[PDB]
């Protein structure tokens, strides 16, 4: 048999409307014309009577949803159907809220300081009981609290030795994942008559290298269920995984329903390995490959008066080829046909990119510049083929600077300097 | 026969090689031993090749010499090699790595192979360039070349000694340079060595210039130096006891800290009737008893000798400490009613070389009660030095641990917070950022601490420099500023300093006649097949002769050479009314911390307060003059003058107009004008004076010339030093010697042992002997005969060696203790060391430190994107704001606390020159710049390259900058306020981004600062090469990568791996026709069938869940 209760307490001395409808598949309960509960095992209500979801001021009450015209209002928190907007509020229906682009992994195994049959420590494993609203200023924890939660049952309430009892619990997950946030769903807030002050829980994250990273001290309250503790990471430092989460507190009344790690979807720091541009990380192989389905093949590239040495026989994706200039030629490298930083060394690495080359390399000859009085004074340097490498051309000393010698021509040498004048005029 | 040498006086003495040699053209090597005296000309050409006929350009050829770089500021001189072929468009100069040391022999070798120019100083490659290529000159012009030695035609003369001049025709490698270092003329008739001169006869291959101006052929000692006994103190230290090894010897050895009885004398002023004491006998008794009880646990036992001075006039007059000058207060009138401490010391004239005098004077404001004279101070051991204490706080409970603090200050103990709260700026390398022997207090045991009036570990706060959370601070240390009830002990690393300074400086206070031990262990010079040679340093006290009271044995050097400073200064100018820059500051040993920085510890010809308040004092013909007098008149050989600060206009062009030596007979010898620099003291060699000299007169036409000290080196075997008795040494070895030489008096300090056996282990130590009194044994040296050691040419890494170049000399790139030097990299089996930083080649270890070689070091897995657009709050033509665009100029070295920023800073960085310098408006104007980047990306860190720390001379407090990040939506995400320090000039500001909040794309970076002295040469974003917010945007299971549309491609293969699925008694509704990767197909169980799940999702051909309808 299945029973469904109303939404609020009965009001003495009032007229109420009760309607129960059962079609053989679904049964519902209607109070004052409004659907309060249903199971299958702003507003205008044509009245000015409260309790049916719409007040006399035509205002929708809390924990009610009103549709249609005239407005019919029904209860949505706990009805068993997770609507498009119940995720944020209705914990008892949709569980916990997972933001778009995140994944929540709940605790797989748990280790606590005090393990006993009546208060087992493996209750905070798996999905918690989000339908349980926490209890404030609780006196006894023997009713259902130990069923879907954990608490130090073996430890009585301490009055003087409570300052030295360091309660701790460590939760290990099946898989290691980068910790973006820590979810702590509670069932107790730690408030008590004998201990008015609450308890602040400090959470420590344990990595795969057994190192503890402190997340700081954070307060704990019922209004913040589930308690989301962000993981503040220094972006300059490399990311680190996490496999175990440690929760530390001193108040024996602190009971945790569940501990979970909220992480991003993919781009894990496993891909922080040697998987750079030109290759795609494998689905699950602990390694990165470069040819899954990409047809990114670049055509063979040749540079005039230059030396090319490719690291691979074929100029396929990820193939880096070193380019150097012949003696008497300078190296000019332009990334994506644009002016960028040059290469100090005599070799430039060019990588294939989806049928195109990342940078263009040119071995232009070294210009020796137009000669002047620096090389030979009182002379005219008239010569046809410019001032590039190998482009020899002569001079003529004007009157009265008579020139004596067999040769009176220079030659722009391989080091970018004009050759020694074999004859000097006086 | 002993080698000869040439002396060039720098006044016209030059030589030219004859025309019968064919000078090298394609490649060459020059090797020369040279001893350069201080105060050279700029540029003093040691030797160079010059072209006379070619008048269009007269820089053709090469030139080696000494020239000053940064001649505008601090003018420091270095060895330079300059070359310009007949093809290159300019001259190329390569300098040494450090300022040249005067009076020391240097092996200078400059090589050129046709592609590179290399310059080795003492065999270590200190400069390398490759701008010049090709031959130096063609054969046709070969007849128009002249090799000049000692100067050029333009009188770029050289002043000093030259020896063993070798000029080659091929570029000798560093190995051959080192091998040819030791030959000293043992060169065969090679057909490759062009010229080798040992100056047997100058006219064999050289000819003089002018008419008869020729250098002086003299005899030079053939470098008997086999051990570098000159151990330079660290940068932060002041004396030899600050050296790492010398103080480590005291830290480890317990025989170096034997009990010591250190005398001290307490001054008690009395009236003529012996009443009214300054401090009662009870007070002095209590203070002395407490001091003895607090020092006797550190093996020091003070001996008290109270002094009774009965002078009513002195007692009546009020004595004041650190005061600058019954009711008469006229300073001129002798009946004034006040006396400074130094005036009291001058009146008393107490001999402080035998006692630690305690002087009493009121110190009305009491936060530094005890004024102590440091051991390295000039006044440490004379009448005007001692301890100054408040008489009312001398022997009263709660006012007693102030004498121990002053005494510790008098034994060379810095305050424990010296590296934190006693630094001018955060860029000072003397900050104890970590416990070290070379920074701050120079004690490893004392943890860094800030200044604190109370005791107890101070928590985080507004640090003066910017470092918070000091842990394990020595709040209970004596040298801290705690109270008298919570300071209890000296750490057993600060006691070692006290014992070192008692052995070194204060040997006269103690009555025990134990000569100071040899501080450092004997060094194994080399082993033969059956012997060994050991050498050791002189005693730590620095004296070589026995100490005799009233004699000159305390100044005699090793070769009976008497070395003395000035002892009686004078001047015709009336002295300063304030007293600063008095002639008395030009006495004793040099005491200036930094060259050419106007200090009150020198003699300035016009002290005054404001310049040009007095009409020109020094006249045109002769100028002002300082007359120094030496204690012991004698016949001198060399004279050294420490000229510290010279005005910019008088850039060594006659700063010291004359130096007149005054004879005992009264005749005057004029030396003529000299040249002076900052760092190098001006040294002169006096040539056949022939008669005793008692004083000098230094003339000057400069109104800011600051003479710091003087010196008068005597001739060898001076009459005074003959009667001195040299110290002797006794070497003991772990197996006892068969016969023990009772005294090994070796002027080289060398011991040759022949009673050795192969495969055995021996230990050697040295005991000093002064007459019949022995000393504490020197630290033992271990020697395994037939095995390796330090100084054998083989790098045995198991012994801690990192370089071993077969020698025992510092400055060659490998330290004396087989340790690598600073900024020197040593390779090959005999360690050839070269100056790696800046040689144009970036190696594997130069990446993380050499900013100007390898650029900014980007860690693996990251990527630096520099600014592509800039904007500033103040833009001007003189100081443009677009300089920071692009990669920065890493060659620039940061400058701290400089008033003028126009020295090329704007050409490489941006600084706000538009604003005026504010005296009180510095907090009213906020400066900012904003740099936009070409490609916005994630912000992992911000890199800001700085040129200045933004510190002013009048503001010791540093500056802080606030950096803000702007995302693609122009939202300011502040990164925090960060201090400005040039010890980490590439400023890395990490980004602390919470992992829950989605990452943004930073478009621009905004950086704000207050003071206008801050200069930025570039702002960049350090970001991950891979990963981005685009991955988090929309890329689910099966979406690998799409084109540039901030998305991933949904169908990238894996569309046929999953075969057709069949479920019994179930209905399949497939959204997609083909069961591709992650395909969704709803499964509905028929009526009466229970649904079991283990919408199914395909996963690489395998269904993620199993659906059945039972
Ligand atoms: Zn002090």
Numbering used by the authors:
A (entry chain A): 102 to 142, 879 to 1263
B (entry chain B): 12 to 336, 403 to 1171, 1186 to 1201
Please give sentences taken from the publication describing this entry:
PAPP-A and its paralog PAPP-A2 are metalloproteases that mediate IGF bioavailability through cleavage of IGF binding proteins (IGFBPs). Secreted PAPP-A is a 1547-residue, multidomain, dimeric glycoprotein which recognizes and cleaves IGFBP2, 4 and 510–17, while PAPP-A2 mainly cleaves IGFBP3 and 59,17–21. The proteolytic cleavage of IGFBPs is required for the release of sequestered IGFs to enable their binding to insulin-like growth factor receptors (IGFRs) for downstream signaling. We show that PAPP-A is a flexible trans-dimer that binds IGFBP5 via a 25-amino acid anchor peptide which extends into the metalloprotease active site.
